[PDB]
């Protein structure tokens with residue numbers, strides 16, 4: 247049901263498997279209930295997990311989708327993580 | 334090739350920008366050429382005079398980011414609800430970076446060659462209109 | 468109406484949704500299913516204020532306006548070491564680097 251995503255600094259992120267499967271890389275890595283990201287920091291992986299919940303909630307909606315916020319400070323690193331994760 | 338039908342049949346449309354972006358409406362003329370129209374501020378509506386069978390698309394007026402209209406890419410006249418798509422986290426990140434860095438300076442950011450080429454490959458209407466031949 | 472949360476204890480963060488009408492005790496049962504710890508060994512917090520089991524998540528401040536998908540609300544978690552509860556501790560996330568001159 248849930249999966250553990252561990253960042254470079256040991257922060258464990260428990261997320262629904264359906265949500266983590268948004269990332270094609272994670273989807274592949276999950277075929278284990280834990281995935282270690284030796285490259286992604288916590289401030290980055292937390293915003294990725296937020297993207298997963300945002301994506302699952304807003305995909306095929308018909309309402310009004312809000313902008314996904316990204317702080318300037320995280321923008322570069324999040325780009326590298328998103329590029330790695332096929333997100 | 335992906336053009337407007339010259340119906341000559343008036344159709345009243347209401348463009349509703351249900352997005353945080355400034356929308357640029359783009360009409361594809363009888364020759365398939367994209368014709369830009371006056372921009373819609375963030376939460377604004379506009380009663381426009383169009384025609385049945387005419388083709389429309391909506392993009393971000395500044396960055397040219399793609400937008401949806403009634404959950405799809407193209408609009409054929411009536412309510413035209415312009416919304417943000419759920420962009421990928423990669424596209425969203427590229428958008429933010431592009432909005433903070435001058436095109437010339439993209440080569441100065443400490444990232445992989447692929448990402449430099451991803452930033453350089455700006456959203457374009459002509460490029461989109463070509464992807465819509467498949 | 469759903470609400471979006473980050474349930475946080477030490478270096479552990481659970482990402483879940485719940486109804487505004489869901490009670491604090493019902494959230495404890497969600498944590499129980501994940502962290503394998505009973506509600507009686509659990510303590511939940513909003514901004515370091517201990518939440519009552521019978522109170523709804525809306526009454527506890529988690530609403531559609533505050534607990535969004537892209538920006539979830541934080542619920543603090545603490546476990547009992549038999550007896551006595553451990554002090555609430557949430558390890559802060561890693562710090563981002565100094566913004567590049569090129570992106571300032």
Ligand SMILES: O=C(NCc1ccc(Cl)cc1)[C@@H]1C[C@@H](O)CN1C(=O)c1ccccc1Cl
Pocket residue numbers: 358360370371372379381382383384387
């Ligand atoms: O211009 C037009 N309507 C006025 C208007 C003003 C401002 C805004 Cl934001 C939107 C609409 C229409 C729309 C399109 O079908 C184009 N069109 C025509 O009246 C037309 C018809 C045949 C050939 C060429 C043209 Cl321009």
